[PDB]
Amino acid sequence: KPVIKMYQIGDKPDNLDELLANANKIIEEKVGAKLDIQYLGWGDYGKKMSVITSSGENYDIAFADNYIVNAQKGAYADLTELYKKEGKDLYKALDPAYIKGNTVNGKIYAVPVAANVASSQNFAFNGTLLAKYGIDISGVTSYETLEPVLKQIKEKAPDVVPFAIGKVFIPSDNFDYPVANGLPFVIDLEGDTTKVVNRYEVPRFKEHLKTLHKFYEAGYIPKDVATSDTSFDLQQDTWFVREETVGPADYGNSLLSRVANKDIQIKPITNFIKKNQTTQVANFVISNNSKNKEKSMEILNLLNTNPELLNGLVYGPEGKNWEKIEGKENRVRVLDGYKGNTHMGGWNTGNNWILYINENVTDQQIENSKKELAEAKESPALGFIFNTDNVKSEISAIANTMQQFDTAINTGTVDPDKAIPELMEKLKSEGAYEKVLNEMQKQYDEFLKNKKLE
Ligand SMILES: CC(=O)N[C@@H]1[C@@H](O)[C@H](O[C@@H]2O[C@H](CO[C@H]3O[C@H](CO[C@H]4O[C@H](CO)[C@@H](O)[C@H](O)[C@@H]4O)[C@@H](O)[C@H](O[C@H]4O[C@H](CO)[C@@H](O)[C@H](O)[C@@H]4O)[C@@H]3O)[C@@H](O)[C@H](O[C@H]3O[C@H](CO)[C@@H](O)[C@H](O)[C@@H]3O)[C@@H]2O)[C@@H](CO)O[C@H]1O
């Protein structure tokens, strides 16, 4: 039984050995291999995985970073044939938007987790503090309208971080990204949807960055946001508000209330839509240098199709963390063991449709989810995936410049009125910027042109 090496983002569960022992009972039997998972953390997952992939390291499975760029670098196994056999079952369950968003030169290199194919960005509020301090959030619709409630929590509970964001944070908006959000190129969904634009020059987005900087100056965001490895545990009163992606797989605020083990209230700030990001939010890839591509896909297939296996990991050990509710099909309740770091997250583990539904999820939530999924629309740029063939060096150059300046801007640490012009000047200094922008606009023109009937 070879050991299959999987890399995952974020922090290791405290009972990983138990989780994997439970999981490997099923995997070893069905596949003849043992899964091992190594977790790489949150704050620097991109940098870490870039060492792994650019070095051609042996691994079998990974949660992808910079998927569209690396797929064109040949970092990942083409899954075209594996999806005809080992991954046939998981593949049948994917919404067409997952195929559009993850197809690169006519080939799919990822197993995306079937879950929030559409979603919106939300502020998620700590209900303990809302109730304790009686703070009114009914006006909260944007980064800007957040200000009065952060001012209040700051005055009332000085030990609480008002807005908990960390170094990986990027302000959200109604944008589609033809590459990924570590680059500035977006389609503005509220603007001219035929144009590729620089997010730092979109007026309202520049305004958000100003807002974040004012929050940073006011002490609403951590002083060391740009460098901190501190997390804000969903269960703890260390934070008042944070930004969360929510979609139909979460059943409204039930999932965040379950994981936080308290009432979490949400407020949307972006449109609920299928767009490149929502289809790429959890992609598993197989290393193109893997020596076990078939068993790797068999594991990914099981993670996405076997409810015993998936629930065992996402809920944790049955009996300790959760139990089936008698005479209610596919319903569970969590138990004391589930409280904290003793399970994995559904969104980056496997098809959320095969997850048991927890007791705290209401019939209204179930009906809302069904309705939201049925009505979700596609962004006009869903499936517009930028081809890097002509701009390989210029893309690297842009990414290099971005890595060096973008954390201080995105977190509000530096004044964006000073920093954005410095970043733009550096991006333009050797013309890598202009070349990539023009090529992206030319491809986008073709993409849109070819959908119009002759
Ligand atoms: C409840 C649930 O499972 N919800 C999921 C969503 O998580 C998922 O959205 C995606 O979420 C990832 C992960 O971010 C969240 O989890 C991070 C880890 O939290 C856990 O571990 C911590 C210890 O490391 C614990 O402290 C914590 O209790 C928990 O155990 C967490 O750190 C993160 O919150 C921080 O970071 C976010 C992002 O910067 C920031 O907004 C927060 O304020 C806070 O500082 C979250 O709680 C996330 O990485 C994904 O982000 C990418 O994709 C989105 C959507 O495109 C982009 O906007 C964003 O810029 C990133 O590119 C995404 O948000 C959804 C996916 O559909 O599925 C739900 O079911």
Residue numbers in the entry: 40 to 493
Task: Quote the original article.
The genome of S. pneumoniae contains genes that encode a suite of proteins that are biochemically capable of performing the various concerted steps needed to completely depolymerize and transport all classes of N-glycans found on host glycoconjugates. Here we characterize SpGH92 (TIGR4 locus tag SP_2145) as an α-mannosidase that trims the terminal α-(1,2)-linked mannose residues on high-mannose glycans to generate a substrate for EndoD. We also identify a solute binding protein (SBP; NgtS) from an ABC transporter (ABCNG) that binds soluble N-glycans and, through X-ray crystallography, reveal the molecular basis of its interaction with these branched glycans. The identification of an ABC transporter that possesses an SBP, NgtS, that is specific to the recognition of N-glycan fragments suggests that this is likely the convergence point of the complex and high mannose N-glycan processing sides of the N-glycan degradation pathway, with this transporter functioning to import soluble N-glycan fragments into the bacterium.
ITC using Man5GlcNAc as a ligand gave an association constant (Ka) of 1.04 (± 0.01)×106 M−1, which is consistent with the range of affinities previously determined for other SBPs, and a binding stoichiometry of 1.05 (±0.01), equating to the expected 1:1 protein to ligand ratio. Despite these two complexes being obtained with different ligands and in different spacegroups, the overall conformations of NgtS were very similar (rmsd of 1.0 Å over 427 matched Cα positions); both complexes were in a “closed” conformation relative to the “open” conformation obtained in the absence of ligand. As with other SBPs, the ligand-binding site was found at the interface of the two domains comprising NgtS and ligand recognition involves a transition from the open, unbound form to a ligand-stabilized closed form. The reducing end of the carbohydrate is oriented into the base of the protein binding cleft and fully sequestered from bulk solvent with no room for additional residues present at the reducing end, consistent with our proposal that NgtS specifically binds the products of EndoD hydrolysis (i.e. having only the single non-reducing GlcNAc residue). The additional α-(1,3)- and α-(1,6)-linked mannose residues of Man5GlcNAc provide a number of direct hydrogen bond interactions with the protein and an extensive network of water mediated hydrogen bonds. The classic CH-π interaction between aromatic sidechains and carbohydrate rings, such as that seen in binding the Man1GlcNAc core, is notably absent between the protein and the mannose residues in the glycan arms, though Trp81 does participate in hydrogen bonding with the terminal α-1,6-linked mannose. The structure of NgtS in complex with this ligand revealed a specific network of interactions, with the suite of interactions between the reducing end GlcNAc residue and the burial of this sugar at the base of the binding site imparting specificity for the reducing end motif glycans.
